[PDB]
């Protein structure tokens, strides 16, 4: 149990917080609450996250378009999730990178520029863990499938590198 927080370098008054949970029993209810907005924040599938940098890049771009009023989706919480996908199909991105009712691991990401974190955590029927546990949750075969990563890309860099390059340029084709 321990959060990870990072300031956004381009938006220095903004702090991004990551919370990781395992053995979650109520992913369906959590999904409904985030949809209704009662739970403030992005509920993300941790099995396809290879490094917090992936989250922070998605968050930076989301806040950027939030402040410009040019988000592709309707809320900052969905925009963060959408930015993780390599594709521009919104419903697919939210299905693949958001949580579904059967999931037992969940990552919560929120941004402040103040939320009662204890109450947020109490809503999860599960056990919070350090983000140092993320690599044990990540499923590399699912990551390579969603991002369509090739051996060619892995020969000149990391999987994270290829993921980020895809995330960051999908908006200019």
């Amino acid at each position: 149990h321990m959060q990870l927080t990072h300031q956004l370098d381009l938006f220095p008054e903004c702090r991004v917080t990551l919370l990781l949970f395992k053995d979650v029993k109520n992913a369906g209810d959590l999904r409904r609450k985030a949809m209704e907005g009662t739970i403030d924040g992005s509920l993300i599938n941790p099995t396809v996250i290879v490094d917090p940098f992936q989250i922070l890049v998605a968050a930076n771009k989301a806040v950027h378009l939030y402040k410009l009023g040019k988000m592709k989706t309707r809320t900052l919480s969905t925009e963060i999730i959408f930015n993780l996908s390599p594709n521009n199909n919104i419903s697919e991105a939210l299905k693949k990178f958001g949580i579904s009712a059967n999931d037992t691991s969940i990552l919560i990401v929120y941004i402040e520029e103040q939320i009662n974190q204890e109450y947020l955590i109490s809503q999860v029927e599960g056990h919070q863990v350090s983000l140092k546990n993320l690599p044990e949750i990540m499923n590399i075969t699912e990551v390579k499938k969603i991002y369509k990563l090739s051996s060619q890309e892995e020969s000149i860099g990391t999987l994270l590198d290829a993921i980020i390059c895809r995330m960051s340029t999908k908006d200019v084709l």
């Binding site: 950027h64 402040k67 009023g69 060619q152 890309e153 290829a162 980020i164 390059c165 960051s168």
Partner: protein, 229 residues
């Protein structure tokens, strides 16, 4: 929309003012620092006051877009180049991985010529550049501004890990003439910057010709472009 756009450009200016300026060309300033915990370079295509502002915004956007697209193309094709972290189209800033501890091919060649006093030991370097640029052209990627300063050697230096940079003038073309011009530009930059290293460029051309699947029409166009100038 104007207020929010102005605020974003001011945010960008503030962020750049915290970075180290490391390079400046005709059209771009390159700054270095950290971006969300990773070593990063941010390239700002900056306007010149004496040109028409509408044209400058278009030009800055176009070169930012083309470089981002080229870098994605390189990575998916297995051509070593910086990965893109973030593209800010409000400010024409491109956020990129830093190639840490690297040296330009230009500096490496010049240091060699200074110490060894002969280019014989640079044929391996030339052969590597030939393989890299053959792969780039075979993906129909024209760099547009080839010099020995737009190629980096990533540590450890003696492994000859070439990284291509600065694709703002790049474009996609299958035309051998465009590839011949790309090589002709490299040749003139190379011979003028590195006098009396002709055996190095000869070894580059030999390796490019072997490595590229379609070099024959390209090298014929190189001869034609040389003659015309």
């Amino acid at each position: 929309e104007a207020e929010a756009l102005a605020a974003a450009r001011e945010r960008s200016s503030r962020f750049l003012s915290g970075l180290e300026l490391v390079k400046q060309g005709a059209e771009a300033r390159v700054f270095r620092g950290r971006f969300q915990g990773r070593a990063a370079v941010i390239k700002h295509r900056f306007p010149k006051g004496y040109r028409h502002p509408a044209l400058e915004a278009r030009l800055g956007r176009r070169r930012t877009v083309q470089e981002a697209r080229a870098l994605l193309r390189c990575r998916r094709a297995g051509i070593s180049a910086p990965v893109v972290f973030f593209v800010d189209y409000a400010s024409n800033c491109l956020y990129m991985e830093e190639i840490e501890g690297s040296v330009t091919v230009r500096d490496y060649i010049q240091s060699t010529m200074e110490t060894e006093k002969t280019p014989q030991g640079l044929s391996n370097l030339a052969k590597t550049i030939g393989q890299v640029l053959a792969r780039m052209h075979d993906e129909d990627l024209i760099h547009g501004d080839l010099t020995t300063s737009n190629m980096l050697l990533k540590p450890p230096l003696e492994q000859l890990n070439i990284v291509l940079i600065d694709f703002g003038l790049s474009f996609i073309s299958a035309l051998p003439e465009d590839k011949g011009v790309d090589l002709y530009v490299l040749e003139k930059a190379f011979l003028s910057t590195h006098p009396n290293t002709e055996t190095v460029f000869e070894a580059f051309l030999k390796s490019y010709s072997t490595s590229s699947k379609k070099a024959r029409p390209v090298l014929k166009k190189l001869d034609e472009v040389r003659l015309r100038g």
